[PDB]
Design a protein around this ligand. Structure first.
Ligand SMILES: O=S([O-])[O-]
Ligand SMILES: O=S([O-])[O-]
Ligand SMILES: O=S([O-])[O-]
Ligand SMILES: O=S([O-])[O-]
Lengths: 220, 219, 222, 220
């Protein structure tokens, strides 16, 4: 009966374009949906080595991996077996702007992800093209309903070389495939994403994320 | 050393939104180390306010935040000298607000010289029409930007009709005593609430609670 | 410093592949124009994805700055970018959250320019003017051309006229990069724009587009 | 039918607070409304010398000084003799944000301007606090009505040392004092502001503006 199982697999294919540079990246990972933890092994098939910081791709690599408590409606786990899809905009503080789409589907213990990524106006001397990023700092997403659609806004920062921070503002719009899926009320989703390991050219990447939902102070 | 477990709070706030001057006085208390604080507010001039009182609340001290041991408390170490902050509020309908505050301490009480200015609020907007309900809980991102500690918040106002209203805020904190160590990147959980008020919002009770943390998985 | 190889009467060969709100489409373009008068006209034709569930207007500026009246006192970065050609990247930010990215690779071969165009929009509200197709007209705008991070960049403040006398704000930044080296960067200058849909069918499967652009250096010398 | 003379005098006094620095500037000049030109001598009464770039203030130092054609409704000259007021937000690309107000009342032959200005969050090493600005480039104001109010949005740029540019996005709201003043349609207003002369620390500044209203191409 259960559409969401304790241990599930993740199959992902990304096709993208940043500043004209086409790229194709494959993923194959595992995760625990009810614990909000997933890990994935990536491998760029085309366009390696990448000319930009790999970090800007990480959040495009499923909120069905998040620990939802009882008092908050879990929109994403209720979206399967049919699945869902999202759209995202990434506005960086130095002009660089990205859009991204993902169409998620399920078969058995496996999620399938059709991911698209596009970025423009990234300056050559910028920390993205200079590859001076280190990690995404831990963040907190704001979930709320906007125009009948579950939307998530995140203020977010990249750690740069030299104790500097690089600002990125994101908006995601989630839409279930099935009709009649209960939209949740306002809530927060704490995030944490990390590159566990990589080779020199970032042709091989192991990514890990942890996400938890809550109602904020003083409920958490 | 300079901050007692219980403190008194005094706040004078003059402002202008859409050409409307106003003067508000605040007298309340709070326990800094526990991260909680309360305050009674009175519109001594400009009442009744033709705009939603909620936009003023965040202007009405991060020293009232529960900081752990593993995170540098830049605000509690800014005393007895005190500190200042500037702020910019950017609402989604075009309304822009700026604010500043000088925080001092003579004895056991906190003195706050706050100013507030807001422009370009739409007439039928949820602010000038008082369609707001409360500030939804948020998370401030603390990080050093150009040698100055900076807090950025994506906060949302709950409106009437189960709708939310966007506001992006950037605050720059500056300690008076030169030498106060800047903290690393960290988060500050926030929850603000109007506990009680009258019809025309002349007398208002405000309450806050702030907890600092390292985020996942250290929170 | 060399011959632009751009004759006063040029042709345009365009093909756009794009995605908006998950909806995929393919559009082809055929038109003519005069680079020295800063005027051009094109016949668009939705090959795939028709009919478009969104406003056609958001696509129109994606459908070449080589068609702009540049005075000889202002450096014409685009005309001197040929015969090698150039390419641009653009971000479109609407006031309701909708964000578009677009890029065009422009080449010249003989008498005709060629455009490989891509367009991507996200986060448009279901009841916004775009998805409801309540747009009417691109108001005349002025693009601010200047070198930024060693790259010629243009910033505009655009507005769509809606039904009911309302305006739909949009902020656009375009970056321009030449394929050949040695092309001189211009100083700050303005570019006046006026794009207009002259004719179309009901479902906008076939559209007739027109642009007129004139560069200048603002008051008082304009 | 508005009692606006071809040659008018301008009286002005600004009180402001940028970066915590309080200041007072007085202004006295003349202008030609139907030719859209105006000149003004400025004097720093308090706060001198200003620790920030003077250029960020000049845009605040009256749109009746704009040449309007006959096919465009001149909302500003139709607001007198009762006068009008405006509000403005200045958003810079580096985080610096300014608000500004002015109440304009006409007393016979002289225009009076009660101006207020406030600026926050300017980086210590930005071109403003370092005073690296050279001038405002000529721009174009997009006038249109939003929620029953005349509004102008401008993409303007400050020329910096080395011929770099410093972006600023601005929005102004105009409100006539008298009820039922006919709102104009979408039109453009070309601007140029130029500091003609100044003293060492900008305590005395000669300012000039030239504004012309039009309806864009091909009317240009
Ligand atoms: O970033 S780490 O905590 O996964
Ligand atoms: O803690 S308060 O929200 O009751
Ligand atoms: O308008 S002034 O810059 O000649
Ligand atoms: O160029 S005219 O047709 O707007």
């Amino acid at each position: 009966m259960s559409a969401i199982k304790p241990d599930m697999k993740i199959n992902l294919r990304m096709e993208g374009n940043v500043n004209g540079h086409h790229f194709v990246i494959d993923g194959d990972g595992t995760g625990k949906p009810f614990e909000g933890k997933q890990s994935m092994d990536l491998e760029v098939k085309e366009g390696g080595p990448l000319p930009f910081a790999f970090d800007i791709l990480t959040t495009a690599f499923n909120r069905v991996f998040a620990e939802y408590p009882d008092h908050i409606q879990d929109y994403f786990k209720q979206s399967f077996p049919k699945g869902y899809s999202w759209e995202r905009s990434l506005t960086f503080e130095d002009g660089g702007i990205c859009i991204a789409r993902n169409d998620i589907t399920m078969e058995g213990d496996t999620f399938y992800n059709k991911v698209r990524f596009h970025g423009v106006n990234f300056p050559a001397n910028g920390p993205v093209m200079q590859k001076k990023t280190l990690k995404w700092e831990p963040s907190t997403e704001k979930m709320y309903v906007r125009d009948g659609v579950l939307t998530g806004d995140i203020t977010m920062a990249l750690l740069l070389e030299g104790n500097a921070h690089y600002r990125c503002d994101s908006r995601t719009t989630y839409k279930a495939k099935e009709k009649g899926v209960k939209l949740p009320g306002y809530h927060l989703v704490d995030h944490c994403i990390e590159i566990l390991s990589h080779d020199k050219d970032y042709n091989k990447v192991k990514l890990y994320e942890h996400a938890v939902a809550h109602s904020g102070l003083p409920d958490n």
